[PDB]
Structure 1
Amino acid sequence: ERRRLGVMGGTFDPIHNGHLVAASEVADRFALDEVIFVPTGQPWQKQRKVSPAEHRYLMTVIATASNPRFTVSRADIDRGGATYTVDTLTDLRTAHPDADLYFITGADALASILSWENWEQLFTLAKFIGVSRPGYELSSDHIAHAELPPDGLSLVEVPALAISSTDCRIRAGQARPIWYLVPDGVVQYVAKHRLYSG
C-alpha cells in the first residue's frame, strides 16, 4: 500500500482556520495519510508586501502542531528564487519516492500553475486538488486551456474558505479582532510581532 500524501501549498499570510478546514476535508475525502503544508518561499509579486518567510513558516507550524496528520515543509522557503510548483513537487518526490502525491491549493492559484508551468512534469509528479470558497465560480474547463490528464484534477468547495488571509490582514491593520478566524497562538504571534499593524 503506497502512502498517500497531501501537499498543501500557500503563502499563508496568515494561515487561518479556512486553510485548516480545507486540508482536513481533503485528507478525509481522498484518504490521505498525511498533509504536508508548504509555505511559499518567494511568492509571485502582486501589485503588496508579504511577511518574511520565516514568520509565515512559524505561523504555519503553530497552526498545524496539534494535528497528528499535518506537518510543515521548508522546501519552498529553502529554495532560492521565486517559488514554482514543479520545483515544490520535485523536491517532495525526492523526499518521498514511494508516495502518491496530491497537490492542494486555492483554485485560482492552480489556474496560474497550469498556465505557466510544464504539464508533462506536473502530472508525472502528482494529482491536483483545487479548493474554493462559496460563490467562487470556476469550472474545471476554465481552470485550464486544454484537456487535463485522466484523474489528474479534482475540485472541492470548502465553505470555511469564505475566511481569507487578506481580510485577516486588513482587520489586524484596523485593530479589529481576528480571534476565531485565525488559530490561537497565531493570533498572538501576529500581534506581538506587529506583522500587519504597520
Structure 2
Amino acid sequence: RRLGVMGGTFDPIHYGHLVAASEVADLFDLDEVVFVPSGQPVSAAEHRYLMTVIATASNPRFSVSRVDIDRGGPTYTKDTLADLHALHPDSELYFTTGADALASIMSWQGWEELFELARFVGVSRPGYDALTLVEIPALAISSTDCRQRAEQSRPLWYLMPDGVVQYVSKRRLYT
C-alpha cells in the first residue's frame, strides 16, 4: 500500500495542487493522497482546512488530515510523518510538496529520519531515489497570485474549484 502526503499551507488550494497530487498518484501508483494543511506558523487554519476539504471532496482517492493543524505549535514534517505512520502503519509514505520548500530540507529537524519514514517528491512549474523532482505545468498557478487576485477583486474562476472560489469570496479571506 502507498499513500501520498500533500504537505502545504494551501492558502488557497488551487488546481495546480490538485493536478500535482493527481499526477504524483499516477506516477508512483499511489492508492490515496492525503492533503495535510500545515499548522498556523496566513488565513486561519480552519479556513485552509475547509477549502482543502471542499477542493478534494469529489475525488474518491483524496482525503484531508488535521494532524498538523491540531498538533499545537508550528509544523515540522518529522511530526507529520510520525503521526501518519502511526495512523497508516502498512503504507509507504510519499511526502509531496513544492520543490522550493524542499530546497531547505537540510535545515528541517530529523533530516535523516525523514528519509527513513518517506520518499520525497518535489513538484514545481517547469524550469526548476530519496528525492524525485517532478515538473507540473499547472503549478504555474500559485496561491500568492490567487490571493492578489482576490485582494484586487479579479476573478478566481477556473483557477480552483467553484466551491473554493465562493468560499474565498463569501468568507472575505483576502480582502
TM-score clears 0.5: yes
Taking the aligned partners of 1:94 and 1:184, their CA distance within structure 2 comes to 35
Structure 1: which 5+ residue stretches go unaligned?
A: 44-49, 138-150
Paired position in structure 1 for 2:16? 18
Cα separation, 1, equivalents of 2:40 and 2:152? 26
Give 1:87 deviation, angstroms.
0.5
- Identify the residue that residue 179 of structure 1 maps to in structure 2: 157
Give how far 1:41 is off. 1.1
- Matches of 2:89 and 2:81, distance apart in 1: 11
Aligned length: 175
More helix by share: 2
Q: Does the alignment pair 1:101 with 2:93? A: yes
CA deviation vs aligned residue, 1:100-156 (integer Å, no higher than 9, x gap): 000000001112233232222101111100000123x2xxxxxxxxxxxxx211110
Aligned: 1:116 with 2:108:
yes
Cα deviation 1:137-178 (Å, max 9, x = unaligned): 2xxxxxxxxxxxxx2111100000000000000000000001
Matches within 5 A, 1:134-153: 134-135=126-127, 137=128, 151-153=129-131
Q: 1:169 aligns with which of 147, 152, 157?
A: 147
Alignment root-mean-square deviation, CA: 0.9
Unaligned runs of 5+ in 2: none
What TM-score, normalized to structure 1?
0.86
CA distance in 1, matches of 2:64, 2:93: 15
**Are the equivalent residues in 2 in contact too, given 1:85–1:113 (CA < 8 A)?**
no
1:38 aligned residue: 36
Please give the alpha-carbon distance, in whole angstroms, between the structure 2 residues aligned to 1:16 and 1:160: 10
Secondary structure (helix, strand or coil) at the match of 2:149 reads helix
Selected match of 1:51 from 37, 43, 46? 43
Aligned partner of residue 162 in structure 2, secondary structure: coil
Return the alpha-carbon distance in structure 1 between the equivalents of residues 81 and 167 of structure 2: 29
Amino acid at match of 2:26: D
What CA distance in whole angstroms lies between the structure 1 residues aligned with 2:109 and 2:102? 10
TM superposition shift of 1:42: 2.1
1: CA distance between counterparts of 2:66 and 2:126?
Answer: 30
Distance, in Å, in 1 between the alignment partners of 2:22 and 2:109 is 27
TM-score, length-scaled by structure 2? 0.97
| Pairing partner for 1:69 from 61, 69, 85 | 61
C-alpha distance in structure 2 between counterparts of 1:114 and 1:181, whole Å? 33
Once residues 159 and 117 of structure 1 are traced to their aligned partners in structure 2, the CA distance between those partners, rounded to angstroms, is 31
Q: Bigger radius of gyration, 1 or 2?
A: 1
Question: Which of the residues 164, 170, 173 maps onto 1:192?
Answer: 170
Aligned-partner SS, 1:60 = helix
